[PDB]
Amino acid sequence: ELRVGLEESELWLRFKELTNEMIVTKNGRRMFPVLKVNVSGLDPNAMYSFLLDFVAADNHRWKYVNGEWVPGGKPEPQAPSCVYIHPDSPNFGAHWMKAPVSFSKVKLTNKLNGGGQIMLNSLHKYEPRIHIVRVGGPQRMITSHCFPETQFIAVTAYQNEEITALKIKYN
Ligand SMILES: CCn1cc(NC(=O)C2CCC2)cn1
């Protein structure tokens, strides 16, 4: 059975219990913590690409109001985000299972750009999701996994200094 797990879940849970925030810039900003996934149960010899996208967790705008995050009252349907291809893709099952698959080079932006950078809406809450795509073979296959532990609000600057402090303490 194909098993997908989150590396460093206990750290992600520290961020999550404060409401995690990720900075977005015009040119795009890398994530901290980095999404790292433990994968087992692949065919060592089969061919796979690792894809990353961000699901709008709800249809609302969020605002930091008197030291706490609160959703607006005006739901807007959230278009799905663009997909980031892990740069080691495409690659053998063995490659993907020998060390945690680390998305250290994805950059989160607030502006439509050449591409590579993933555009998110500022003050929307996001749930990271991967797709493991079996490629090359006749029969294609996808397996998808969400990481609730890694939810965050996209922000142009940090609102909760408790987050600012955790980011510095562990980077
Ligand atoms: C990072 C190098 N790279 C990989 C691709 N495309 C794929 O792997 C396709 C299989 C479905 C997505 C394009 N560039």
Domain coordinates in residue numbering, the chain: 1-171
Check pocket membership of 133 for ligand 1, CB cut-off 6 A: yes
Tell me the torsion sign for CA atoms 152, 154, 160, 166. Answer: positive
Question: Within a 10 A sphere around the Cβ of 143, how many other Cβ atoms?
Answer: 15
Q: Which ligand 1 atom is nearest residue 135's CA?
A: 10
Q: Looking at ligand 1, which residue's alpha carbon is closest to its atom 4?
A: 89
| Method by which the coordinates were obtained | X-ray
Q: What are 10's two structure tokens?
A: 């206990």
DSSP per position, 71-140: E-S---PPPPPPPEEPTT-SEEHHHHHHS-EE-TT-EEESS--SSSSEE--TT-EEEEEEEEEEESSSS-
Q: How many CB atoms lie within 10 A of CB 21?
A: 21
Rounded (5°) CA angle 106-108-111: 130
Q: How many whole angstroms from its chain centre is CA 140?
A: 24
Q: Any idea which fold 1-171 has?
A: Immunoglobulin-like (2.60.40)
DSSP 8-state code for residue 168: H
Q: Whose CA is nearest to atom 3 of ligand 1?
A: 89
**Ligand 1 contact, 90 CB (< 6 A):** yes
Provide the b/e sequence for 99-131 (b: ≥16 CB within 10 Å). Answer: ebbebeebbbbbeeeeeebbbbbebbbbbbbbe
Cβ atoms of 150 and 6 within 8 Å: the answer is: yes
